[PDB]
Coordinates of all heavy atoms in Angstrom, one line a residue:
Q72 N -43.7 39.4 -147.4 CA -44.0 38.2 -146.8 C -43.7 38.3 -145.3 O -42.7 38.8 -144.9 CB -43.2 37.0 -147.4
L73 N -44.6 37.8 -144.5 CA -44.5 37.7 -143.0 C -44.0 36.3 -142.7 O -44.4 35.3 -143.3 CB -45.8 38.0 -142.3 CG -46.6 39.2 -142.8 CD1 -47.9 39.3 -142.1 CD2 -45.8 40.5 -142.7
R74 N -43.0 36.2 -141.8 CA -42.5 34.9 -141.4 C -43.3 34.3 -140.3 O -43.4 34.9 -139.2 CB -41.0 35.1 -140.9
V75 N -43.8 33.1 -140.5 CA -44.5 32.4 -139.5 C -43.5 31.8 -138.5 O -42.6 31.0 -138.9 CB -45.4 31.3 -140.1 CG1 -46.2 30.5 -139.0 CG2 -46.4 31.9 -141.1
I76 N -43.7 32.1 -137.2 CA -42.8 31.6 -136.1 C -43.5 30.7 -135.1 O -43.0 30.5 -134.1 CB -42.1 32.8 -135.4 CG1 -43.1 33.7 -134.8 CG2 -41.2 33.6 -136.4 CD1 -42.5 34.7 -133.8
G77 N -44.7 30.3 -135.5 CA -45.4 29.4 -134.6 C -46.9 29.3 -135.0 O -47.4 30.1 -135.8
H78 N -47.6 28.2 -134.7 CA -48.9 28.0 -135.1 C -49.7 27.2 -134.1 O -49.2 26.2 -133.6 CB -49.0 27.4 -136.5 CG -48.4 26.0 -136.6 ND1 -47.1 25.8 -136.8 CD2 -49.0 24.8 -136.4 CE1 -46.9 24.4 -136.8 NE2 -48.1 23.8 -136.6
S79 N -51.0 27.5 -133.9 CA -51.9 26.8 -133.0 C -53.2 26.8 -133.7 O -53.5 27.6 -134.6 CB -52.0 27.3 -131.6 OG -52.4 28.6 -131.6
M80 N -54.1 25.8 -133.3 CA -55.4 25.7 -133.8 C -56.4 25.9 -132.7 O -56.2 25.4 -131.6 CB -55.6 24.3 -134.4 CG -57.0 24.1 -135.0 SD -57.0 22.6 -136.0 CE -56.7 21.3 -134.9
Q81 N -57.4 26.7 -132.9 CA -58.5 26.9 -132.0 C -59.8 26.6 -132.8 O -60.3 27.4 -133.6 CB -58.6 28.3 -131.4 CG -59.8 28.6 -130.5 CD -59.7 29.9 -129.8 OE1 -58.9 30.8 -130.2 NE2 -60.6 30.1 -128.8
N82 N -60.4 25.4 -132.5 CA -61.6 24.9 -133.2 C -61.3 25.0 -134.7 O -60.3 24.4 -135.2 CB -62.8 25.8 -132.8 CG -63.0 25.6 -131.3 OD1 -63.1 24.5 -130.8 ND2 -63.0 26.7 -130.6
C83 N -62.1 25.8 -135.5 CA -62.0 25.7 -137.0 C -61.0 26.9 -137.5 O -60.9 27.1 -138.7 CB -63.3 25.8 -137.7 SG -64.4 24.5 -137.3
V84 N -60.4 27.6 -136.6 CA -59.5 28.7 -136.9 C -58.1 28.3 -136.6 O -57.8 27.8 -135.6 CB -60.0 30.0 -136.2 CG1 -58.8 31.0 -136.0 CG2 -61.1 30.6 -137.0
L85 N -57.2 28.7 -137.6 CA -55.8 28.5 -137.4 C -55.2 29.8 -137.0 O -55.6 30.9 -137.5 CB -55.2 28.0 -138.7 CG -53.7 27.7 -138.8 CD1 -53.3 26.7 -137.8 CD2 -53.5 27.2 -140.3
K86 N -54.3 29.8 -136.0 CA -53.6 31.0 -135.5 C -52.1 30.9 -135.8 O -51.4 30.2 -135.1 CB -53.9 31.1 -134.0 CG -55.2 31.8 -133.6 CD -55.9 31.2 -132.4 CE -55.4 31.7 -131.1 NZ -56.2 31.2 -129.9
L87 N -51.7 31.7 -136.8 CA -50.3 31.7 -137.2 C -49.6 32.9 -136.5 O -50.0 34.0 -136.7 CB -50.2 31.8 -138.7 CG -50.9 30.7 -139.5 CD1 -50.9 30.9 -141.0 CD2 -50.3 29.3 -139.1
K88 N -48.6 32.6 -135.7 CA -47.8 33.6 -135.1 C -46.7 34.1 -136.0 O -46.0 33.3 -136.7 CB -47.1 33.1 -133.8 CG -46.2 34.1 -133.1 CD -46.6 34.3 -131.7 CE -47.9 35.1 -131.6 NZ -48.2 35.5 -130.2
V89 N -46.6 35.4 -136.2 CA -45.7 36.0 -137.1 C -44.7 36.9 -136.4 O -44.9 37.3 -135.2 CB -46.4 36.8 -138.2 CG1 -47.2 35.9 -139.1 CG2 -47.3 37.9 -137.6
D90 N -43.6 37.1 -137.0 CA -42.5 37.9 -136.3 C -42.7 39.4 -136.5 O -41.8 40.2 -136.0 CB -41.1 37.5 -136.9 CG -41.0 37.8 -138.4 OD1 -42.0 38.2 -139.1 OD2 -39.8 37.8 -138.9
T91 N -43.8 39.9 -137.1 CA -44.1 41.3 -137.2 C -45.4 41.6 -136.7 O -46.4 40.9 -137.0 CB -44.0 41.7 -138.7 OG1 -42.9 41.1 -139.4 CG2 -43.9 43.2 -138.8
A92 N -45.5 42.5 -135.8 CA -46.8 43.0 -135.3 C -47.4 43.9 -136.4 O -46.7 44.7 -137.1 CB -46.6 43.8 -134.0
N93 N -48.7 43.7 -136.6 CA -49.4 44.6 -137.6 C -49.5 46.0 -137.0 O -50.2 46.2 -136.0 CB -50.8 44.1 -137.9 CG -51.5 44.9 -139.0 OD1 -50.9 45.8 -139.6 ND2 -52.8 44.6 -139.3
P94 N -48.8 47.0 -137.6 CA -48.8 48.3 -137.0 C -50.2 49.0 -137.1 O -50.4 49.9 -136.3 CB -47.8 49.1 -137.8 CG -47.8 48.4 -139.1 CD -48.1 46.9 -138.9
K95 N -51.1 48.5 -138.0 CA -52.4 49.1 -138.2 C -53.5 48.3 -137.4 O -54.7 48.5 -137.8 CB -52.7 49.2 -139.7
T96 N -53.2 47.5 -136.5 CA -54.1 46.8 -135.6 C -55.1 47.8 -134.9 O -54.6 48.7 -134.2 CB -53.5 46.0 -134.6 OG1 -52.5 45.1 -135.2 CG2 -54.5 45.1 -133.9
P97 N -56.4 47.7 -135.1 CA -57.3 48.6 -134.4 C -57.5 48.1 -133.0 O -57.2 46.9 -132.7 CB -58.6 48.5 -135.3 CG -58.6 47.2 -135.8 CD -57.1 46.8 -136.0
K98 N -58.1 48.9 -132.2 CA -58.8 48.4 -131.0 C -59.9 47.4 -131.5 O -60.6 47.7 -132.4 CB -59.5 49.5 -130.2
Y99 N -59.9 46.2 -130.9 CA -60.7 45.2 -131.4 C -61.2 44.3 -130.3 O -60.6 44.2 -129.2 CB -60.1 44.4 -132.5 CG -59.1 43.3 -132.0 CD1 -59.5 42.0 -131.7 CD2 -57.7 43.6 -131.9 CE1 -58.6 41.0 -131.3 CE2 -56.8 42.6 -131.4 CZ -57.3 41.3 -131.1 OH -56.4 40.4 -130.7
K100 N -62.3 43.5 -130.6 CA -62.8 42.5 -129.7 C -63.3 41.4 -130.6 O -63.8 41.6 -131.7 CB -63.9 43.0 -128.7
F101 N -63.3 40.2 -130.1 CA -64.0 39.0 -130.7 C -65.3 38.8 -130.0 O -65.3 38.7 -128.8 CB -63.1 37.8 -130.6 CG -61.9 37.8 -131.5 CD1 -60.9 36.8 -131.3 CD2 -61.7 38.7 -132.5 CE1 -59.8 36.8 -132.1 CE2 -60.6 38.7 -133.3 CZ -59.6 37.7 -133.1
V102 N -66.4 38.8 -130.8 CA -67.7 38.5 -130.2 C -68.5 37.5 -131.0 O -68.2 37.4 -132.2 CB -68.5 39.9 -130.1 CG1 -67.7 40.9 -129.4 CG2 -68.9 40.3 -131.5
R103 N -69.3 36.7 -130.4 CA -70.2 35.8 -131.0 C -71.6 36.5 -131.1 O -72.2 36.8 -130.1 CB -70.3 34.5 -130.3 CG -71.1 33.5 -131.1 CD -71.1 32.1 -130.5 NE -71.9 31.1 -131.2 CZ -71.4 30.4 -132.2 NH1 -70.2 30.5 -132.7 NH2 -72.2 29.5 -132.8
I104 N -72.1 36.8 -132.3 CA -73.4 37.5 -132.4 C -74.5 36.5 -132.3 O -74.4 35.3 -132.6 CB -73.4 38.3 -133.7 CG1 -73.3 37.4 -134.9 CG2 -72.4 39.4 -133.7 CD1 -73.8 37.9 -136.2
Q105 N -75.7 37.1 -132.0 CA -77.0 36.4 -131.8 C -77.7 36.4 -133.2 O -77.6 37.4 -134.0 CB -77.8 37.2 -130.8 CG -77.2 37.2 -129.4 CD -77.2 35.9 -128.7 OE1 -78.2 35.2 -128.7 NE2 -76.0 35.5 -128.2
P106 N -78.6 35.4 -133.4 CA -79.4 35.4 -134.6 C -80.2 36.7 -134.6 O -80.7 37.2 -133.6 CB -80.2 34.2 -134.5 CG -79.7 33.4 -133.3 CD -79.0 34.4 -132.5
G107 N -80.4 37.2 -135.8 CA -81.1 38.5 -136.0 C -80.2 39.7 -136.0 O -80.7 40.8 -136.5
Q108 N -79.0 39.6 -135.4 CA -78.1 40.8 -135.4 C -77.4 40.9 -136.8 O -77.2 39.9 -137.5 CB -77.1 40.6 -134.3 CG -77.7 40.8 -132.9 CD -78.5 42.0 -132.8 OE1 -78.0 43.1 -132.8 NE2 -79.8 41.9 -132.6
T109 N -77.1 42.1 -137.1 CA -76.4 42.4 -138.4 C -74.9 42.7 -138.2 O -74.5 43.0 -137.1 CB -77.1 43.6 -139.1 OG1 -77.1 44.7 -138.2 CG2 -78.5 43.3 -139.5
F110 N -74.2 42.6 -139.3 CA -72.8 43.0 -139.3 C -72.4 43.3 -140.7 O -73.1 43.0 -141.7 CB -71.9 41.8 -138.7 CG -72.1 40.5 -139.4 CD1 -71.2 40.1 -140.4 CD2 -73.1 39.6 -139.0 CE1 -71.4 38.9 -141.0 CE2 -73.3 38.4 -139.6 CZ -72.4 38.0 -140.6
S111 N -71.2 44.0 -140.8 CA -70.7 44.3 -142.1 C -69.7 43.2 -142.5 O -68.9 42.8 -141.7 CB -70.0 45.7 -142.1 OG -70.9 46.7 -141.8

């Protein structure tokens, strides 16, 4: 169990702050895709 130490809301997404960093976090970006584009 990860301990939630804070929380905020961004539109329809909840952002729960936890006391443990995920050690397996990849390099990442958030993007909004265009219609017709694919994803996994």
Side-chain angles (χ1 to χ4, degrees), residues 73 75-94 96-97 99 101-111:
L73 318 175
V75 181
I76 61 170
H78 64 273
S79 59
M80 179 167 67
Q81 177 173 11
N82 300 308
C83 299
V84 154
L85 183 58
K86 273 141 90 173
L87 302 176
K88 177 125 287 187
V89 292
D90 64 346
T91 317
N93 185 6
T96 308
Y99 79 88
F101 290 168
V102 306
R103 188 173 177 86
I104 58 157
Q105 302 287 311
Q108 289 309 293
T109 54
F110 54 98
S111 298

